[PDB]
Amino acid sequence: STAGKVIKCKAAVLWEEKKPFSIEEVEVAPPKAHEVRIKMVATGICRSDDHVVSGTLVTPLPVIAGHEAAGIVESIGEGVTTVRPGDKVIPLFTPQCGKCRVCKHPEGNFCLKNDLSMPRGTMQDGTSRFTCRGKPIHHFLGTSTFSQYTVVDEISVAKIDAASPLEKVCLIGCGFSTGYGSAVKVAKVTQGSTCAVFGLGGAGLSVIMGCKAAGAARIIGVDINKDKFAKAKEVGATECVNPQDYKKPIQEVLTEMSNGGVDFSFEVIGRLDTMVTALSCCQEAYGVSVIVGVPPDSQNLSMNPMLLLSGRTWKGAIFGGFKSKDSVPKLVADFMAKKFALDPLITHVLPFEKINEGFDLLRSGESIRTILTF
Amino acid sequence: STAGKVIKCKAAVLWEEKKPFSIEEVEVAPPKAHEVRIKMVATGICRSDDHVVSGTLVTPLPVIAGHEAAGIVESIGEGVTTVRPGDKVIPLFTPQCGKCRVCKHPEGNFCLKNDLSMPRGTMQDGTSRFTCRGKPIHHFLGTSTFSQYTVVDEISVAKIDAASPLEKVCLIGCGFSTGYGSAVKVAKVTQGSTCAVFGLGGAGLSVIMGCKAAGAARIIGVDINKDKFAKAKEVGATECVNPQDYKKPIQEVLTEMSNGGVDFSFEVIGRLDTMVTALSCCQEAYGVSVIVGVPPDSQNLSMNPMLLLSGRTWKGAIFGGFKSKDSVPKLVADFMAKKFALDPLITHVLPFEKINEGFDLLRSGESIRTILTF
Ligand SMILES: NC(=O)c1ccc[n+]([C@@H]2O[C@H](COP(=O)([O-])OP(=O)([O-])OC[C@H]3O[C@@H](n4cnc5c(N)[nH+]cnc54)[C@H](O)[C@@H]3O)[C@@H](O)[C@H]2O)c1
Numbered sequence: 001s002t003a004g005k006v007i008k009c010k011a012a013v014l015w016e017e018k019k020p021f022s023i024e025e026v027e028v029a030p031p032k033a034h035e036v037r038i039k040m041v042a043t044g045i046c047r048s049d050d051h052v053v054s055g056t057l058v059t060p061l062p063v064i065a066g067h068e069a070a071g072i073v074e075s076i077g078e079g080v081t082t083v084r085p086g087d088k089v090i091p092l093f094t095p096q097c098g099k100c101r102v103c104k105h106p107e108g109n110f111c112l113k114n115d116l117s118m119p120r121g122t123m124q125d126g127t128s129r130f131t132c133r134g135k136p137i138h139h140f141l142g143t144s145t146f147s148q149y150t151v152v153d154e155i156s157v158a159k160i161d162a163a164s165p166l167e168k169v170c171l172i173g174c175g176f177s178t179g180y181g182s183a184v185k186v187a188k189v190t191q192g193s194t195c196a197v198f199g200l201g202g203a204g205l206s207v208i209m210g211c212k213a214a215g216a217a218r219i220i221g222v223d224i225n226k227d228k229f230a231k232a233k234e235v236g237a238t239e240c241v242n243p244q245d246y247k248k249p250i251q252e253v254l255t256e257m258s259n260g261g262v263d264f265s266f267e268v269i270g271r272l273d274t275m276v277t278a279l280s281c282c283q284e285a286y287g288v289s290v291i292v293g294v295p296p297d298s299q300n301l302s303m304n305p306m307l308l309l310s311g312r313t314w315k316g317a318i319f320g321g322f323k324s325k326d327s328v329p330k331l332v333a334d335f336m337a338k339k340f341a342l343d344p345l346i347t348h349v350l351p352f353e354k355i356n357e358g359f360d361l362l363r364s365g366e367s368i369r370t371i372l373t374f
Numbered sequence: 375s376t377a378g379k380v381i382k383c384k385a386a387v388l389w390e391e392k393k394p395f396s397i398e399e400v401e402v403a404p405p406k407a408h409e410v411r412i413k414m415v416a417t418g419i420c421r422s423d424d425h426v427v428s429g430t431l432v433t434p435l436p437v438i439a440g441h442e443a444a445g446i447v448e449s450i451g452e453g454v455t456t457v458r459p460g461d462k463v464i465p466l467f468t469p470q471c472g473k474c475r476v477c478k479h480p481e482g483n484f485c486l487k488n489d490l491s492m493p494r495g496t497m498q499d500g501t502s503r504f505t506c507r508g509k510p511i512h513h514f515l516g517t518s519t520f521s522q523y524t525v526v527d528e529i530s531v532a533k534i535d536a537a538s539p540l541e542k543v544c545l546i547g548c549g550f551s552t553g554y555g556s557a558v559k560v561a562k563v564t565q566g567s568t569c570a571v572f573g574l575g576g577a578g579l580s581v582i583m584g585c586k587a588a589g590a591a592r593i594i595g596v597d598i599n600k601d602k603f604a605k606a607k608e609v610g611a612t613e614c615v616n617p618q619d620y621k622k623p624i625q626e627v628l629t630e631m632s633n634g635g636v637d638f639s640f641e642v643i644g645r646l647d648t649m650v651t652a653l654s655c656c657q658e659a660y661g662v663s664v665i666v667g668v669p670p671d672s673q674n675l676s677m678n679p680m681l682l683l684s685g686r687t688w689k690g691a692i693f694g695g696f697k698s699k700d701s702v703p704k705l706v707a708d709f710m711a712k713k714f715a716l717d718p719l720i721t722h723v724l725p726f727e728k729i730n731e732g733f734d735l736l737r738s739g740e741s742i743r744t745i746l747t748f
Pocket residue numbers: 046047048051174175178198199200201202203204222223224225228243268269270271274291292293294295317318319320367368
């Protein structure tokens with residue numbers, strides 16, 4: 001039995017920025033009240049994890065990163081009512097406390113208990129459950145999935161279908177749900193519309209999936225890497241364009257292609273310039289542009305507010321606008337009912353021990369999602 | 375007797391920026407096909423007219439400005455079907471051609487025939503109906519209401535109730551409809567919500583009217599001129615704040631006052647800094663901010679897109695989002711049925727010949743709207 005005891009297990013520790021993960025033994029404390037300890041089964045490599053490595057995202061180090069995952073509950077602390085030992089679960093990098101003003105709002109999902117805005121890198125109680133080489137190690141987004149075992153707050157975990165294939169549904173923990181929701185929930189793409197999607201990685205492909213599910217007539221994929229185009233078309237893009245192929249700025253190209261601007265545009269990269277381009281390419285009177293990409297820390301963009309005064313709407317969202325704990329189990333159930341596909345996002349499957357090689361596949365442009373298996 | 379003939383009349387010509395208007399004789403050509411010549415009855419002094427004088431808004435000079443007005447049709451050109459001589463009308467500074475993709479869109483109102491985005495200062499056919507001292511004079515927004523007679527394109531005029539009081543309803547041609555629609559149609563203010571309104575001039579007061587009509591529980595007016603507060607409270611503000619009273623930035627003050635950010639905010643001034651402040655003060659996950667104010671020409675704002683990524687919506691609109699020709703007659707009918715009030719916006723009345731004194735009143739901070747009578 002491990003319940004009530006410290007577990008020594010393997011994890012991928014990031015000691016400093018811009019260095020490889022160190023795969024080594026950590027100690028994982030048992031869960032306190034209202035906490036859940038999870039044996040990880042699969043975790044995805046998301047670009048946002050790479051942002052921690054690259055310094056695009058700032059969070060306290062050293063850290064156990066990872067936020068897109070699925071596993072099995074090993075034990076629960078006093079007072080947990082929503083999961084039990086043996087349950088399949090997905091950690092929620094955006095919590096759902098159910099009590100704050102955001103959780104109570106019909107359209108809000110960025111729960112005030114999140115550790116994204118002003119990261120502390122701890123459990124809700126301000127402490128860590130991880131030690132390595134005698135040193136405390138930070139959590140990441142209340143998830144920390146790059147470990148054989150993690151401990152999360154109850155508000156940061158959802159129970160999912162016992163029959164779920166964890167090596168696929170982990171993607172409901174970030175990339176699929178983010179893109180899909182950004183289209184269907186945040187933008188509210190309409191039937192017959194024209195959409196433009198900037199960035200054709202895992203999140204952008206999931207945006208395309210959502211635009212197609214919503215009935216868009218045209219879905220224009222935009223990427224500087226033309227190797228991304230074939231898979232974009234497979235999941236619903238009607239055309240793809242590479243800005244590098246044109247003498248004009250791509251917002252002008254897209255405005256021309258759409259006979260005056262697109263209905264819906266999405267920035268799914270994380271660059272200030274493409275955020276402004278994406279806004280500009282939507283129709284000036286009624287267009288909507290949604291920011292999904294995470295830009296570099298503390299940098300501001302510049303834009304002309306006449307882009308908004310004419311009638312554009314500009315918004316962003318975390319996790320596709322989904323209330324996390326309510327939504328994740330329903331998304332898994334929908335997947336099990338064949339309502340959407342996940343395989344198109346998965347290009348590589350590697351053992352956890354190959355985490356660094358997985359990050360190299362992402363950085364080279366060669367992968368969409370690598371799933372790591374414990 | 376004047377049909378088909380040039381009319382000589384008085385107009386207020388702006389020859390140069392940062393100079394008084396010149397009240398002097400102009401020649402007004404008869405209407406060509408699908409044009410309407412209007413004998414003006416009343417016109418308001420809007421801050422956007424002052425922006426032409428100050429160079430905040432760039433439009434070709436020399437010009438006959440004026441865009442908020444009401445009058446009586448003197449004659450119609452060939453093919454006009456929607457008004458007749460003797461009809462009361464309001465010129466539409468945002469046209470409604472009824473045929474472009476925006477006019478056809480259920481939400482859109484910024485008709486592609488507008489002369490706002492890239493002003494030419496002409497009629498739709500690229501020519502002018504005005505001569506002064508033998509020189510052609512530009513139009514403004516297709517309306518040019520600072521003249522005893524103007525000529526407008528048919529898509530830029532709406533017929534209104536024959537019993538309408540023109541010295542009141544002219545305000546439906548800009549300030550009232552802009553602010554009221556910005557609240558009720560663009561933001562879609564909800565019952566029980568908390569709103570913040572930056573700028574308590576004619577447009578901002580009309581935003582407050584709309585927020586109150588929509589059932590907001592709290593409406594916080596924000597102005598650096600505390601003399602504006604009494605009227606703001608009369609039309610529905612629950613509290614007023616002057617940024618100059620506070621050591622902290624007003625976005626922080628408003629976030630504190632609203633226990634974590636407002637539901638809806640409105641920028642109704644025309645400053646880049648207050649556009650960003652108004653965005654920031656809305657709740658980060660579900661807040662909505664609407665830009666109403668007109669920015670200084672060709673200047674960009676700077677902002678951190680994390681404000682949007684958390685969930686905020688940012689939008690702007692012209693003329694409160696109203697499809698102009700459809701909406702203006704209905705707004706007049708509603709005014710006649712006492713569904714809203716216009717008198718709170720009218721602080722001064724002057725003859726047209728005292729237009730410069732009317733601009734002095736606006737610039738000093740003393741007036742909300744001065745209505746000029748011809
Ligand atoms: N808002 C959220 O909740 C959330 C969730 C998931 C991902 N993200 C962010 O979304 C972004 C995309 O993530 P991902 O899909 O996993 O990453 P990814 O797989 O790296 O995809 C990004 C794509 O952008 C392409 N690209 C790079 N520069 C340009 C350019 N100038 N023009 C056009 N295309 C370009 C690039 O070739 C690649 O295919 C990242 O910034 C993530 O951090 C945000």
